[PDB]
């Protein structure tokens, strides 16, 4: 619902989300070459 | 879960080496885990 959102907010009006009590499977994310830039700071994406 | 044989433990991300046993000390309901002296994880409660 966040990545496939119909519209995105402005950069000056960045919207902040709440995510809790759920299982995250980031393996699907970086394995798809649909993102031009995928940079991580402080944690390896392969070990998420 | 294993008790009397030292293994690799990983409780909600926190991980290390050693052996486990039932704690003579008692936690309060909110408490997650304890630490003896400095950087000595001495007791955790099973998340399951």
């Amino acid at each position: 619902e966040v990545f496939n959102a119909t519209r995105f907010a402005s950069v000056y009006a960045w919207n902040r989300k709440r995510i809790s009590n759920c299982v995250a499977d980031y393996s699907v994310l970086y394995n798809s070459a649909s993102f031009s830039t995928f940079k991580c700071y402080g944690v390896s994406p392969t070990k998420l | 879960l294993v008790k009397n044989k030292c293994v690799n433990f990983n409780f909600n991300g926190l991980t290390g080496t050693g052996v486990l046993t039932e704690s003579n000390k008692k936690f309060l309901p909110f408490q997650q885990f304890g630490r003896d002296i400095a950087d000595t994880t001495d007791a955790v409660r099973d998340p399951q």
């Binding site: 402080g42 944690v43 070990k47 | 926190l14 290390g16 950087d39």
Partner: protein, 48 residues
């Protein structure tokens, strides 16, 4: 003390990062820890 690193425990650093970017953090841990051990050994030697 983390000695300016991301964390203090080795397990968290090795889990969060990958070696080509972890090695700097483990190295920054090593320099401080070696300094502390050298200080302790020097103090113990003069005391002895």
């Amino acid at each position: 003390s983390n000695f300016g690193a991301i964390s203090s425990v080795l397990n968290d650093i090795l889990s969060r990062l990958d070696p080509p970017e972890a090695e700097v953090q483990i190295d920054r841990l090593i320099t401080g820890r070696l300094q502390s051990l050298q200080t302790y050994v020097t103090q113990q030697l003069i005391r002895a």
